[PDB]
Curated annotation (Swiss-Prot), chain B:
It comes from Escherichia coli (strain K12). GO terms for biological process: molybdate ion transport; negative regulation of DNA-templated transcription; negative regulation of DNA-templated transcription initiation; positive regulation of DNA-templated transcription; regulation of DNA-templated transcription. Induction: Constitutively expressed at low levels; probably part of the modE-modF operon. Does not seem to be autoregulated. Functions as an intracellular molybdate sensor. The ModE-Mo complex acts as a repressor of the modABC operon, which is involved in the transport of molybdate. Binds modA promoter DNA in the absence of molybdate, however molybdate binding confers increased DNA affinity. Binds the promoter of moaA activating its transcription; binding is not enhanced by molybdate. The protein dimer binds the consensus palindrome sequence 5'-TATAT-N7-TAYAT-3' and a variant 5'-TGTGT-N7-TGYGT-3'. The ModE dimer binds two molecules of molybdate (MoO4(2-)) with a Kd of 0.8 uM, which results in major changes in the conformation of the DNA-binding domain and confers high-affinity DNA-binding to the transcription factor. Additionally molybdate binding moves the 2 Mop domains closer together, trapping the ligand between them. Can also bind tungstate. Molybdate is bound at the dimer interface using residues from each monomer. This is DNA-binding transcriptional dual regulator ModE. The lineage of its organism: Bacteria, Pseudomonadati, Pseudomonadota, Gammaproteobacteria, Enterobacterales.
Length: 258, 247
């Protein structure tokens, strides 16, 4: 790791609205209770502090700082700006970490940012992919999805109507939500071959309990698959070996932005 | 709404790593296929273009430009800049929303109304007090959701945490028999508002409290006696539900 230092500049009406120094000023105003001590604490003159505050008020059409009921306090909008800025900065810092350690998902994608940094589901699989052209000339009641390698195919059961409401045409980004107990793991291709979906991979981790065994497997694009299988059936399974996961097309829920 | 934009500079080792001008340089290099034309197209001198490339390579510990084409790392750095250009209007719309509650997560705010799923039953609720108890947004219908303590910590399920509840229609049973419904983990009584019988499957829509309508898809021979208007019980296992949070 090498953490990046993030500097954002927000502009409104083609004018500088908020940069690092202005946000620092607003924070020090919140911490100190005054414009004069806050300016001193932020390293800026009193005049330049009021010059910023006045311009920020005019541009945003809101009041950022007010006298307290006297000290200076941040208003609802002043606090909302600091929070928006700091959260946006945090998204960039997290995105930079993803650049640094790498992954197969697009880094320009909103859904992929949502999946990596915000969304958590009880289903232990949450895979990014994209809708692709159907793989047959006849219309069937599912959509076809490519994983982030742009090669690994999956089919998901859905109605034409449902598909239309969610905008599922070629290229639409989606997440695949799939519970782990609904994913089988096998060393017998024929067994997987009677399933709707077959996803080859290598076991990355195994954990056995009394009734169930958890298997984690790297998908071909680097995403992780999680399957829960009855302990009796996981008896031969072992880390580092070749395996195919399999599941039905109607076991998946698609998530997507509309 | 007003013209609004967000500019990003990244520093590494207390030094300049990326800024709009360096990202422009990279994009022009990709398009033109050369450092010298890319510098010309980006309005910087040739030696300044090499200074920037060499500094970016050194501070990052990666190569951004190869023999010219961008590397994957260079393309991905441009994608990081493009993520911000993509979310900027949504972020300014979140800032300008005077009627919204205080901002907790920016990705949750931008996702709340846009994220949609293929499950026909998609409900909001909150955690109340093996599993968790959920109270739907109507404040009355309670659900039991199977989830390990570990996953509950990963989702951050604390009292009052907002959750998204997902249930496909075919995971839901419909019964007019209380002796069947009583042994289910979750029981949701309601009036059947519509029935559609197909050759193998029957879609049942049932009224939920707020005008929410539960959808269930049942094998046709199990719906033979059912009628529009009848009070019925929708039932499902606690482990059939998927619950999600946005942090
Ligand atoms: Ni297909």
């Amino acid at each position: 790791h090498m953490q990046a230092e993030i500097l954002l500049t927000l502009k409104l009406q083609q004018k500088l609205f908020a940069d690092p120094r202005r946000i620092s000023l607003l924070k020090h105003i919140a911490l100190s209770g005054s414009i004069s001590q806050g300016a001193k604490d932020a390293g800026i003159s009193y005049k330049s502090a009021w010059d910023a505050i006045n311009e920020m008020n005019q541009l945003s059409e809101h009041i950022l700082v007010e006298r307290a009921t006297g000290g200076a306090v941040l208003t609802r909008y002043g606090q909302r700006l600091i929070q928006l800025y700091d959260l946006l900065a945090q998204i960039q810092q997290k995105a930079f970490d993803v650049l640094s350690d790498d992954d197969a998902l697009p880094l320009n994608s909103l859904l992929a940012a949502i999946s990596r940094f915000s969304l958590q589901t009880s289903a232990r699989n949450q895979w990014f992919g994209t809708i692709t052209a159907r793989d047959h000339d006849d219309v069937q009641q599912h959509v076809d999805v490519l994983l982030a390698d742009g090669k690994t195919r999956l089919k998901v059961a859905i109605t034409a109507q449902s598909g239309a409401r969610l905008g599922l045409d070629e290229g639409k980004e989606v997440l695949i939500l799939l519970k782990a107990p609904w994913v089988g793991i096998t060393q017998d291709e024929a067994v997987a071959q009677n399933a709707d979906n077959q996803l080859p991979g290598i076991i990355s981790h195994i954990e056995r309990g009394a009734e169930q065994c958890e298997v984690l497997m790297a998908l071909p694009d680097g995403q992780t698959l999680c399957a829960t299988v009855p302990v009796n059936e996981a008896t031969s399974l072992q880390q580092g070996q070749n395996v195919t996961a399999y599941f039905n097309a109607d076991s998946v829920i698609i998530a997507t932005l509309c």
